[PDB]
Each structure stands twice: as structure tokens, then as C-alpha cells.
Amino acid sequence: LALHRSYLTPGDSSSGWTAGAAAYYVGYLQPRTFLLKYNENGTITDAV
Amino acid sequence: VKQLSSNFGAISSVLNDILSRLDPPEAEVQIDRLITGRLQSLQTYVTQ
Amino acid sequence: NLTTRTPAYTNSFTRGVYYPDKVFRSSVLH
Amino acid sequence: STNLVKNKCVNFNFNGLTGTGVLTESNKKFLPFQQFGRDIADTTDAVRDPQTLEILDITPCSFGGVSVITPGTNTSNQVAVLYQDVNCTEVP
Amino acid sequence: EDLLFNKVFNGLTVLPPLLT
Numbered sequence: 001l002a003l004h005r006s007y008l009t010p011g012d013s014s015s016g017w018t019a020g021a022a023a024y025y026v027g028y029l030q031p032r033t034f035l036l037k038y039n040e041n042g043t044i045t046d047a048v
Numbered sequence: 049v050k051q052l053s054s055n056f057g058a059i060s061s062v063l064n065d066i067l068s069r070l071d072p073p074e075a076e077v078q079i080d081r082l083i084t085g086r087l088q089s090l091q092t093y094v095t096q
Numbered sequence: 097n098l099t100t101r102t103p104a105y106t107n108s109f110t111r112g113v114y115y116p117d118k119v120f121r122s123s124v125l126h
Numbered sequence: 127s128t129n130l131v132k133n134k135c136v137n138f139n140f141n142g143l144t145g146t147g148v149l150t151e152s153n154k155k156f157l158p159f160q161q162f163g164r165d166i167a168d169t170t171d172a173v174r175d176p177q178t179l180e181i182l183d184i185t186p187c188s189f190g191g192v193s194v195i196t197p198g199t200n201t202s203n204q205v206a207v208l209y210q211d212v213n214c215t216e217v218p
Numbered sequence: 219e220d221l222l223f224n225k226v227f228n229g230l231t232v233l234p235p236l237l238t
Contacts, residue, residue, distance in 0.1 A: 003098070014099035027108055034113065038121040042157050047113045049167045049227065064144060120156050120163035120172065169227070186228065211231055 056085025130175060135187030141176050147184035149173070156181050188212050 004018040011017075037046040055061050058078040059070070066078045130149070137146045143162055154163060154172050163172030163181075174181050190210035197204060209217050 012099075014097050017098055017100070019101075025106065025108075027112065029112070035125055036113065036116070037125050038123070040122050041155055042120045042122050042160060042163075044113060044115060047110070049169075049230075052228070053168050115159065118159055118161045120154065120160040121165075122154070122163075124166055167227070189229075190231065210233070 051086065051089035054085070055081075057081045127177060130177075130182075132182075138173075138184075140173050143170060143173065145170060145184060146187070148187055149182040149184055152181040152183040154181050154183075188216055 001022060001024075004020055005016045006018055009016060009018065034047045036044045039045045053061050058066060058081040060066050060078075061082075063079065063082065066082075067075050070078065132149055132151075135146060135148050138144065138149065141161070152172055156163060156172070156174055161174060162170050165171040170184060172181055172183055188211070190212045193208045193210065195206040195208065
């Protein structure tokens with residue numbers, strides 16, 4: 001993740017940082033069977 | 049038509065590949081597995 | 097290093113489906 | 127990279143997929159990642175040529191069973207032959 | 219009959235019916 005260092009908060013190397021805004025969601029994958037529905041153009045428009 | 053896509057125990061379900069990537073004496077064992085298998089699928093369609 | 101940093105789970109509603117192969121199928125359920 | 131031929135029953139080996147078919151212009155709109163196109167029953171009915179990125183349809187070439195209509199050997203030795211399921215421009 | 223009718227590869231060939 002990029003860390004923003006700015007003139008506003010020189011602090012020390014540890015304290016020279018700004019969180020800004022970030023969100024990350026990690027979900028692991030498992031072996032599964034899915035029925036995928038492909039439309040006329042070939043896009044997967046649904047799955048079960 | 050789907051049974052044409054099942055190995056029946058050979059290296060591959062495609063006759064061209066078994067013949068192309070194997071020596072002529074040992075491909076005959078692999079084709080004979082497909083021929084016994086594919087013939088059984090046709091006998092079941094005709095009886096049913 | 098870093099300092100002064102002041103987990104919850106959210107439902108994945110039907111997300112994470114990726115085109116399994118490079119084949120094209122139209123109007124088919126596979 | 128041998129040159130492409132169309133409207134003839136030509137054996138073909140594309141980028142690793144091989145079949146015998148008549149290759150013609152296709153109206154199918156393939157998405158960019160897709161390489162071949164398969165119909166129901168796992169049969170490849172479309173391929174995109176690698177060199178010009180154009181979608182080409184594959185249709186099996188003709189195969190029909192000749193049948194013979196005989197007036198009867200006692201009446202005559204004339205016969206007429208029905209080549210089934212063949213537009214009569216490919217019979218010879 | 220019209221109401222009734224409306225409501226209703228490889229090595230394989232479907233031969234056509236004799237009485238159309």
C-alpha cells in the first residue's frame with residue numbers, strides 16, 4: 001500500500017505518514033462447481 | 049455426442065493427438081480403449 | 097517503519113466470478 | 127503461418143487447435159480474450175485467426191449416404207442414386 | 219391444428235418424413 005509522506009507532518013520516519021482513505025477486502029478461493037449463464041454476446045451475466 | 053469427449057482410459061479423447069504424439073505400435077493399445085468405449089455408447093443408444 | 101496507527105467481515109454478495117476459459121459460449125448454461 | 131483459404135473443405139491447424147472444416151466469415155462478436163468459440167455439445171464452431179484477428183466459422187463438410195432406386199432387376203438395369211443431404215453442386 | 223403446432227452434426231443425420 002502506498003504511504004503518503006508530507007511536509008505537513010515531518011515527525012520522524014515512523015511518524016511521517018498519512019492514512020488518507022483506503023479499503024481492501026481479501027476473500028480466499030475454494031474448489032466449487034458453478035453453473036455460469038452466458039448471454040448472446042458471450043458475457044457471463046449470471047451464475048449459481 | 050458427449051461420450052465422444054470421454055477418455056475411457058486412454059491418454060486423450062482426441063484420436064489425432066493419440067496417434068500424433070505416440071509411436072505406431074503403442075497407439076493401438078490406446079485406440080483400442082477408445083473403440084471398445086465408443087462402441088459401447090452406440091450399443092446403448094441403439095438398444096434404448 | 098511506521099507508528100500512530102489508531103477485523104470486521106462483510107458479505108460477498110455474488111462476486112468473484114471470473115471467465116473460467118478462453119472459449120466463447122453464447123446463450124448456453126455451462 | 128500458411129495463407130488462409132475459405133469455402134473449401136480444408137484440414138486446419140490454428141494456434142494448437144486442429145479440425146477439418148469449411149472456414150467462412152462469421153457474424154459472431156467475440157470478446158477480446160476469447161480465442162475459439164464452442165456450441166452446445168462441446169464442438170468448436172468458431173475460431174479467430176491469430177494473424178488478422180478475424181472470427182471465422184467452421185462447418186463440417188458434406189457427408190450423406192448414397193442410396194440406389196432400382197426399378198427391379200427383372201424390369202430393368204437402370205438405377206437412380208439419391209445422395210442424401212447434399213446440395214446438388216458438390217456431388218461430383 | 220395451427221394452435222397445436224405452435225404450442226409444440228458428426229456421423230448423425232435425421233432422415234426426412236415421407237408424408238409431409
